[PDB]
Write a protein that binds this ligand. Structure first.
Ligand SMILES: CCCCCCCCCCCCCCCCCC(=O)OC[C@H](COP(=O)([O-])OCC(O)COP(=O)([O-])OC[C@@H](COC(=O)CCCCCCCCCCCCCCCCC)OC(=O)CCCCCCCCCCCCCCCCC)OC(=O)CCCCCCCCCCCCCCCCC
Ligand SMILES: COC1=C(OC)C(=O)C(C/C=C(\C)CC/C=C(\C)CC/C=C(\C)CC/C=C(/C)CC/C=C(\C)CC/C=C(\C)CC/C=C(\C)CC/C=C(/C)CCC=C(C)C)=C(C)C1=O
Ligand SMILES: CCCCCCCCCCCCCCCCCC(=O)OC[C@H](COP(=O)([O-])OCC[N+](C)(C)C)OC(=O)CCCCCCCCCCCCCCCCC
Ligand SMILES: CCCCCCCCCCCCCCCCCC(=O)OC[C@H](COP(=O)(O)OCCN)OC(=O)CCCCCCCCCCCCCCCCC
Ligand SMILES: NC(=O)C1=CN([C@@H]2O[C@H](COP(=O)(O)OP(=O)(O)OC[C@H]3O[C@@H](n4cnc5c(N)ncnc54)[C@H](OP(=O)(O)O)[C@@H]3O)[C@@H](O)[C@H]2O)C=CC1
Ligand code: SF4
Ligand code: SF4
Ligand code: SF4
Ligand SMILES: [Zn+2]
Lengths: 339, 38, 95, 145, 83, 178, 198, 157, 381
């Protein structure tokens, strides 16, 4: 262990040495931020070239962030990453099944091997992240596969926390940017005209802070928290609201999903990071599940942050010079649906 | 003409010190002793 | 250097100056390295006699400022003699 | 004093002594100032340390090698202005300009002797006495230093 | 490992620093290298170790080799001399 | 002694010849052509640049460059932890903590020069009595990561061993001067 | 030992008396250092009057303001010691007029007497906190736009209380209380032995 | 040779060569290290020879050389200029004032390093880091740019 | 309100301007972007370990800057440097004014748009730094001029090499002389721009080439001769009218006059010691500290503690290439200073930009900053 000395800011010590395999991610970026702010020792396994992880260097202090070359297929790389970590956090995930990695791999196969080694190593705790409402029978292969994982990893690593976040709201997120980027599309398809798929977003930071707090709290063991949010929404208001802040016309036109799953298949064929995914589509119209579960935010210590509050920052880049100065007050809020 | 104030010059509000280090910091006024070495 | 005469002549002319006489690049004119070993001179105060420091320590023989007009007919006096006008140069007065 | 030297002749050297396990006597440093022989007789009643010989090889060390074992022993360190005999535990751990000096109280014994704890970068390096006329007048025990 | 037995414990995490990198240490350790040099058998009670090279060495000091049992060691070089 | 620059001593009254000469100066840009001649002239001069990797700009013995800790010929590191190199460092760069080695000798357990803090003044070179810390000739030690720039005793001692031959030659050349 | 000419220590001394006589309402002390430098000391109210006499007097023309500074002696009731160093290109001599100002007792501004002071007075406010009445535009010059505290005051920590880093979460530079990775080692340097009577 | 792997190794080698050969740098110009580079731009150690642009606006700059102390009043700007540079972009921190605080580390107005403000690729050491020393640092950036394998990572991703 | 600020200007100047069309009606320069705390750090540092700071205030005239601190500290210690050292400081002081002027004239042109003058002279500048490096070991930021005397003797080949540089340097000034002194384009860009009247220059505390350019005859090198400036002969290049041209022409003349002073220094440099022989003020020689006890004690105390200069305060001004550089050093009896106000020729000059750049275009302001030779290290300190 490492006795925590310091005042609490950078150049201080908190005693959390933590491997974080998928740090380069949108959620990840945030996880390393708090861990680094707190003063924790963060080992970031990376596969993308060094150029892309530079954004993580200034976070954390000198000799507090260590980057290791790692390959998912190669078991040895995971082995050495967790050699000297006592906390392992797994954020490995993707939306597009890539040529050389299947949803199973990114969600269930890999995240197993990882926790498996972590145990061999003797890491005190492992935090595994799987998408919210993930039935072993859910339509989207992604969600189901993720469900498959949360089970397995429990056998490789017992009492391994399993936070299960909803789609995340944050700058650089998809949930909010995706819809806002429908601008290019003249019309914005919305299955069931964006109805009956009530959704509860959660700010990225809230999720991050929550995750971090897990690392430094004994109360969470085998817990399957669910960071959800401060307000639910029918996809209709969300879509329009977005377009509202973006100040771009909103033209909700219903599109039969059966045909739309096909549109997802189309972009899905794209070689360079398909923008929409068959598995995405389903997910988007996959209704958010209700909140009866080990609570996440608040329960883990952070009060959720309403979407409207920070939406202005996430959607600003999509506006035009004409609306750039416009502020949240000028715009209207969307409506929640306790349903 | 001069004005009258019985208020102990407190200028804590102008010095520009963070609140924590003005209310939790005790300073000792002492004449330094001599290291016995010299 | 090492320039064919014609280039030099063009150079000198286009520039309007005998640039060859004063080339910027240095060639075997610069002090050779490993110049001989130096035996530097020891200054005063190294005498072994009549060298008492008390007689050579201006550091603290200095005294506290002299005080005039402390709070605790006569002719006018200037800060100092009025300055003397500078004189135009003689090698090159103008330009 | 002066800025230079005129002693072009050779120097002297005096064999060191293992006076004890607390005081390191690198006595080639000694300026034969006899404050040790006094303290060791007047403040403490040891009456062991003494001058031996005459001339420029008067060495102020125990004639036979008998350790200076007494409480009040470590004070010799503080009282020898030269660094001939100094403390063996605090041999070379620090150098005084660096040491931050905090004035505190002796808790090892009930005389409550005043002392100064010299700390560098956050670990105590030395505890030496600070003067209290009534309680410890410039001296501290072998235990509390 | 290092000159001073600086070896991160089997559980310390600064060992992560050495992961995929060389922990810089020097094979040539002084404690040993001085030992190799033999004791100089001078024939005068007090000899001086200028440090070798005069001005290019260490401050000049005189050592008393009078103690028959032990050998004088320059506080600077560590070189030892015996009478 | 003063000198007027740009002060016209007197009013030369225009003479046709003078006027023509001037008018020609404005009309046919005569002085502008003068300037072009100067640059054409250098175009013909040998360029002063050096192939940087193949040729190196000359540095004489006192060049301060990169810190190194020297060792005696025998193999005993020169530093005896007097710690005044720490005292005179202007930037607070050198951190030294010491304890008596098993041999009984004085030596530094930790000697850390923070090169990013160091401003390469060269006073440490000056201050050392045994001259254990020296300003080594190498100036090329640019590093990918900030941590590499912080240097402990082992890097400096290793730096000392690598460059000892040239450091010895450099100190040999300049010690009479000091 | 430096060469000292007493011609100056006499000339300057006399001038000191001359100034004092001409401006007795404000001159408190007038001394000449052993370094041949005069240093009329004036009551803070005499800032405008004493300077103006020196800027515009035939027998003492002190046209340019070399510098305006404020030493801070915390012990002194009037903390700051505003010092104005002036030069006389006509008589090739410099004089220093120094006043005393406490933290909340402002000094007059001399931007009128010398416009050079427009900037230095802003510099003294930013670093030490003395305020100058009738200043055209007094506002921080050297410190950051949001800086809190006057830095050159002897009671201000060197490292200060705030430092800046870029935070990704908020994608913007952000102050945080200073956390230093090697505190300034505070070597004690004063020797316990004095040098001379001085 | 014939393998989709070989074609993707050779083509980045091409992409890396282009970025390596033409690094248009942008010098903020803080403190004095800017002079020790104005000497690199100058004739004894030309930088253009290597494919380095003496003066480049942020939007057309590949490399930012931070020379000089980054005070707490210029920090908010450096980040802006770094943020407004085109994506392929690299930072070289010159001077003990910039890579670490150097003299002025403990000042209340100096950021202790530009690494706190902008991610730094090569740290060039020295109070006035010599001009060859900067040239070695720029050449070290070119060695780092040669090693990068962006196309290979996309192929096996 | 256009907030100009890399600003084409020297250093970093956020010149908050107000563009009445292209004509600029007001400038509010926001300096402070390079304030390092140089004068609050010096209070915590001994007199020798604060010398280095003075090489970084104006970073283009290093040694002349460290001749102002060296003269101050020396005054407060009533000690004077040995004769050879004073000539060496005057030799290095004029190499620095040639170095600053090559900086000021060529970078001004870089701003206006002439690019070649910078390259030709900058090669002549590395020739010069070499002289710094060969005498101190640092190309710039030497630390050679010490509070008492200078640090080490000149290497045995430097004065021959300084002659060879000075012998051929004047042709190099002559060459930019032809390329940038009569070009109608330069004259038009520089002549009648930023005229400053004589009394206004004294009132704004300009004190430099800006003072001399408008015809006021003031050089601290002849008026108040510091070091040996009483035994060297030179002509101050007083300009007549004050336009940015007359100020350029003055800067080109001072480079020429400095070659006249450098010539005299090489011709008449005395045999002797380079640092005062009081071990109390200047460190003891390497051989002496390693053989004599009085010298080791003096070396140990001087490096670890300090000179302990006697209590007092002094304002010492020397003619730095930019203008009058002065240090007001207040000293308690302690080895570390109490206050060190660096008067920067430049804090006064930048204040004048608003008055000098009156009724002028956006382009004129680029020339106005260029003709003040402002380096923000000195202004920001
Ligand atoms: C074109 C026709 C030739 C031009 C020519 O020969 O110029 C050099 C030749 C000598 O000029 P220089 O400035 O005295 O040359 C420097 C040294 O003297 C001579 O320089 P050096 O001592 O280094 O001599 C060796 C040099 C000798 O090289 C040459 O002098 C011939 C260069 C031919 C370039 C074509 O060869 C090399 O160093 C390798 C480079 C060879 C030429 C590289 C460029 C070839 C370009 C081919 C496509 C165009 O020019 C003249 O004879 C007068 C030209 C007047 C023009 C008006
Ligand atoms: C914005 O300010 C700037 C300038 O002014 C606009 C510059 O000029 C400069 C200075 C120098 C440059 C821009 C040089 C630029 C050079 C180029 C754009 C060369 C371009 C060459 C090509 C496109 C060749 C194309 C060839 C083919 C189509 C081959 C086909 C088979 C910079 C860096 C700058 O930032
Ligand atoms: C072979 C390369 C030759 C390069 C020539 C120019 C560079 C060398 C200049 C040397 C020098 O300093 O002397 C300048 C000299 C220097 O003179 P000055 O400016 O010192 O003063 C002389 C003139 N008075 C005294 C009357 C003021 O300039 C001139 O002699 C006048 C040049 C007039 C140029 C008029 C414009 C150019 C010509 C336009 C018409 C077309 C001509 C042909 C164009 C091309 C056709 C193929
Ligand atoms: C029958 C009688 C015929 C008389 C003919 C007289 C010459 C014809 C051209 C005259 C052009 C007009 C002129 O006199 O010069 C204008 C301008 C100089 O004007 P200036 O001196 O500033 O005076 C301003 C007064 N208000 O000129 C300039 O400043 C030009 C700006 C500089 C641009 C570069 C100049 C140098 C160019 C060198 C190469 C020229 C090559 C010309 C030929 C190329 C091949 C065709
Ligand atoms: N809206 C959301 O973001 C939500 C996310 N989650 C879960 O949170 C986790 C983090 O999400 P997010 O950050 O958006 O995901 P990202 O798409 O940002 O990727 C996360 C990280 O996983 C790494 N990664 C992906 N595939 C592989 C692979 N085959 N081998 C090695 N590394 C890989 C990536 O590294 P690289 O880019 O270098 O390949 C990346 O750094 C995910 O696992 C997801 O299941 C759950 C609910 C909502
Ligand atoms: S006190 Fe120290 S110095 Fe004086 S005699 Fe005893 S030992 Fe020698
Ligand atoms: S000065 Fe030389 S010897 Fe003394 S500690 Fe510093 S380095 Fe080691
Ligand atoms: S590093 Fe040395 S040189 Fe570069 S800026 Fe800071 S001080 Fe000036
Ligand atoms: Zn020895």
């Amino acid at each position: 262990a490492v006795i925590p000395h310091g005042k609490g800011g950078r150049s201080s010590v908190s005693g959390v040495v933590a491997t974080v395999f998928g740090a380069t991610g949108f959620l990840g970026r945030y996880v390393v931020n708090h861990l680094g702010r707190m003063g924790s020792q963060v080992i970031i396994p990376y596969r993308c070239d060094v150029y892309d992880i530079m954004h993580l260097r200034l976070m954390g202090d000198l000799g507090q962030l260590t980057f290791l070359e790692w390959d998912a297929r190669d078991k040895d790389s995971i082995r050495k990453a967790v050699q000297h970590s006592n906390v392992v956090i797994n954020l490995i995930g993707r939306e597009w099944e890539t040529r050389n990695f299947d949803f199973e791999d990114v969600f269930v196969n890999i995240p197993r091997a990882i926790a498996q080694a972590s145990k061999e190593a003797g890491v005190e705790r492992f935090i595994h992240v799987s998408h919210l409402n993930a039935s072993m029978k859910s339509s989207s292969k992604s969600l189901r596969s993720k469900a498959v994982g949360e089970k397995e990893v429990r056998s490789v690593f017992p009492e391994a926390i399993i936070i299960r976040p909803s789609d995340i709201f944050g700058r650089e997120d998809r949930f909010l940017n995706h819809f806002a980027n429908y601008r290019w599309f003249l019309a914005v398809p919305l299955v069931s005209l964006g109805f009956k798929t009530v959704k509860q977003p959660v700010y990225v930071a809230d999720v991050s802070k929550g995750i971090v707090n897990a690392t430094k709290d004994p109360d969470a063991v085998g817990k399957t928290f669910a960071f959800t949010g401060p307000n639910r929404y029918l996809l209709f208001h969300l879509v329009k609201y977005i377009f509202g802040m973006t100040h771009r016309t909103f033209i909700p036109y219903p599109l039969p999903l059966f045909v739309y799953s096909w549109i997802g298949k189309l972009f899905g064929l794209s070689p360079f990071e398909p923008w929409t995914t068959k598995d995405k589509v389903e997910r988007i119209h996959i209704s958010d599940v209700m909140p009866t579960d080990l609570p996440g935010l608040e329960d883990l210590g952070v009060q959720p942050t309403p979407l409207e509050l920070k939406s202005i920052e996430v959607l600003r880049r999509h506006r035009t010079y004409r609306w750039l100065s416009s502020e949240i007050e000028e715009t209207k809020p969307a409506k929640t649906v306790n349903y | 003409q001069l004005i009258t104030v019985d208020e102990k010059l407190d200028i804590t509000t102008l010095t520009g010190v963070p609140e924590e280090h003005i209310k939790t910091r005790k300073v000792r006024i002492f004449v330094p002793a001599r290291n016995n070495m010299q | 250097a090492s320039a064919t005469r014609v280039i030099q002549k063009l150079r000198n002319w286009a520039s309007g100056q005998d640039l060859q006489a004063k080339l910027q690049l240095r060639y075997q004119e610069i002090a050779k390295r490993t110049q001989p070993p130096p035996k530097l001179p020891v200054g005063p105060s190294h005498k072994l006699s009549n060298n008492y420091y008390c007689t050579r320590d201006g550091r603290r023989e200095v005294v506290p400022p002299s005080i005039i007009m402390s709070s605790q007919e006569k002719k006018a006096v200037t800060p100092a003699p009025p300055m003397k006008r500078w004189e135009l140069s003689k090698d090159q007065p103008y330009l | 004093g002066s800025d230079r030297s005129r002693f072009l002749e050779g120097k002297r050297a005096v064999e060191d002594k293992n006076i004890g396990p607390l005081v390191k006597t690198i006595m080639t440093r000694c300026i034969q100032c006899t404050r040790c022989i006094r303290f060791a007789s007047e403040i403490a009643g040891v009456d062991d340390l003494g001058t031996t010989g005459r001339g420029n090889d008067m060495q102020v060390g125990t004639y036979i090698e008998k350790m200076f074992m007494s409480e009040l022993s470590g004070n010799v360190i503080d009282i020898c202005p030269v660094g001939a005999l100094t403390s063996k535990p605090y041999a070379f751990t620090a150098r005084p300009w660096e040491t931050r000096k905090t004035e505190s109280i002796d808790v090892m014994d009930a005389v409550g002797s005043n002392i100064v704890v010299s700390t560098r970068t956050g670990e105590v390096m030395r505890i030496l006495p600070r003067m209290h006329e009534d309680i410890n007048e410039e001296w501290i025990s072998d235990k509390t230093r | 490992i290092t000159h001073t037995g600086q070896v991160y414990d089997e559980k310390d995490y600064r060992r992560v620093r050495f992961v995929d990198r060389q922990k810089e240490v020097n094979e040539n350790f002084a404690i040993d290298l001085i030992a190799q040099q033999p004791v100089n058998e001078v024939e005068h009670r007090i000899i001086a170790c200028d440090g070798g090279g005069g001005a290019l060495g260490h401050p000049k000091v005189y050592i008393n080799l009078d103690k028959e049992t032990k050998t004088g060691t320059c506080g600077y070089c560590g070189l030892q001399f015996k009478q | 002694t003063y000198k007027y620059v740009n002060k016209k001593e007197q009013e030369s009254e225009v003479d046709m010849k003078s006027a023509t000469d001037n008018a020609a100066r404005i009309l046919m840009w005569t002085e502008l052509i003068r300037g072009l001649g100067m640059t054409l002239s250098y175009l013909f001069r040998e360029p002063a640049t050096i192939n940087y990797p193949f040729e190196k700009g000359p540095l004489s013995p006192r060049f301060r460059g990169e810190h190194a800790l020297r060792r005696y010929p025998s193999g005993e590191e020169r530093c005896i932890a007097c710690k005044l190199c720490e005292a005179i460092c202007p930037a607070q760069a050198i951190t030294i903590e010491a304890e008596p080695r098993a041999d009984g000798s004085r030596r530094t357990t930790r000697y850390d020069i923070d090169m990013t803090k160091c401003i390469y003044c060269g006073f440490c070179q000056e201050a050392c009595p045994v001259d254990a810390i020296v300003e080594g000739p190498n100036f090329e030690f640019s590093t990918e990561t900030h941590e590499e720039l912080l240097y402990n005793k082992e890097k400096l001692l290793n730096n000392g061993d690598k460059w000892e031959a040239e450091i010895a030659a450099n100190i040999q050349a300049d010690y009479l001067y000091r | 030992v430096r060469p000292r000419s007493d011609v100056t220590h006499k000339q300057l001394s006399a001038f000191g008396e001359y100034v004092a006589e001409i401006l007795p309402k404000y001159v408190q002390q007038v001394q000449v250092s052993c370094l041949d430098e005069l240093e009329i000391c004036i009551h803070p109210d005499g800032v405008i009057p004493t300077l103006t006499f020196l800027r515009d007097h035939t027998n003492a023309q002190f046209k340019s303001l070399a510098d305006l500074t404020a030493v801070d002696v915390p012990t002194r009731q009037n903390r700051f010691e505003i010092v104005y160093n002036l030069l006389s290109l006509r008589f090739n001599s410099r004089i220093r007029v120094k006043t005393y100002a406490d933290e909340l007792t402002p000094i007059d501004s001399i931007v009128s007497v010398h416009i050079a002071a427009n900037w230095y007075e802003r510099e003294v406010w930013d670093m030490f906190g003395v305020f100058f009445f009738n200043h055209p535009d007094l506002r921080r010059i050297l410190t950051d736009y949001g800086f809190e505290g006057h830095p050159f005051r002897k009671d201000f920590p060197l490292t200060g209380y705030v430092e800046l880093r870029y935070d990704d979460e908020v994608k913007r530079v952000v102050a945080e209380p200073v956390e230093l990775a090697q505190e300034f080692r505070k070597f004690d340097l004063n020797s316990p032995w004095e040098a001379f009577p001085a | 040779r014939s393998r989709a792997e070989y074609v993707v190794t050779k083509l980045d080698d091409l992409i890396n060569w282009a970025r390596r050969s033409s690094l248009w740098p942008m010098t903020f110009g803080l403190a004095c290290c800017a002079v020790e580079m104005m000497h690199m731009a100058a004739p004894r150690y030309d930088m253009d020879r290597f494919g380095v642009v003496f003066r480049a606006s942020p939007r057309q700059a590949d490399v930012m050389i931070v020379a000089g102390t980054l005070t707490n009043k210029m920090a908010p700007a450096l980040r802006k200029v770094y943020d407004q540079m085109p994506e392929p972009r690299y930072v070289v921190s010159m001077g003990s004032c910039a890579n670490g605080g150097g003299y002025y580390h403990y000042s209340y107005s100096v950021v202790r390093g530009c690494d706190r403000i902008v991610p730094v690729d090569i740290y060039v050491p020295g109070c006035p880091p010599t001009a060859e020393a900067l040239l070695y640092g720029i050449l070290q950036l070119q060695r780092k740019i040669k090693r990068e394998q962006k196309l290979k990572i996309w192929y096996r991703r | 309100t256009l907030n100009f600020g890399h600003p084409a200007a020297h250093g970093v100047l956020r010149l908050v301007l107000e563009l009445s069309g292209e004509m600029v009606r007001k400038c509010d320069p926001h300096i402070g972007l390079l304030h390092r705390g140089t004068e609050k750090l010096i209070e915590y540092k001994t007199y020798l370990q604060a010398l280095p700071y003075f090489d970084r205030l104006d970073y283009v005239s290093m040694m002349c800057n460290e001749q102002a601190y060296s003269i101050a500290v020396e005054k407060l210690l009533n000690i004077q440097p040995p004769p050879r050292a004073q000539w060496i400081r005057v030799l290095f002081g004029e190499i620095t004014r040639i170095l600053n002027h090559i900086m000021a004239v060529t970078t001004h042109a870089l701003d206006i748009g002439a690019m070649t003058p910078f390259f030709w002279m900058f090669e002549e500048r590395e020739k010069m730094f070499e002289f710094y490096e060969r005498v101190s070991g640092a190309r710039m930021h030497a630390a050679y001029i010490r509070p008492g005397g200078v640090h080490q003797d000149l290497p045995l080949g430097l004065l021959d090499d300084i002659y060879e540089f000075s012998k051929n340097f004047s042709l190099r000034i002559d060459e930019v002389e032809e390329m940038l002194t009569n070009n109608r384009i330069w004259r038009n860009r520089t002549v009648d721009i930023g005229v400053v009247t004589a009394e206004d220059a004294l009132n704004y505390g300009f004190s430099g080439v800006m003072l001399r350019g408008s015809g006021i005859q003031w050089d601290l090198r002849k008026t108040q001769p510091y070091d040996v400036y009483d035994q060297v002969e030179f002509d101050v290049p007083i300009g007549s009218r004050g336009d940015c041209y007359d100020r350029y022409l003055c800067r080109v003349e001072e480079m020429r006059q400095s070659l006249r002073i450098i010539e005299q220094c090489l011709n008449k440099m005395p045999p002797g010691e380079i640092k005062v022989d009081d071990a109390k003020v200047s460190p003891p020689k390497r051989a002496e500290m390693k053989t004599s006890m009085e010298s080791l004690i003096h070396h140990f105390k001087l490096y670890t503690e300090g000179y302990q200069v006697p209590p007092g305060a002094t304002y010492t001004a020397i003619e730095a290439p930019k203008g009058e550089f002065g240090v007001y050093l207040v000293s308690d009896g302690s080895s570390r200073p109490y206050r060190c106000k660096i008067k920067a020729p430049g804090f006064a000059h930048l204040a004048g930009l608003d008055k000098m750049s009156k009724g002028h275009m956006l382009a004129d302001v680029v020339a106005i900053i260029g003709t003040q030779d402002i380096v923000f290290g000195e202004i920001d300190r």
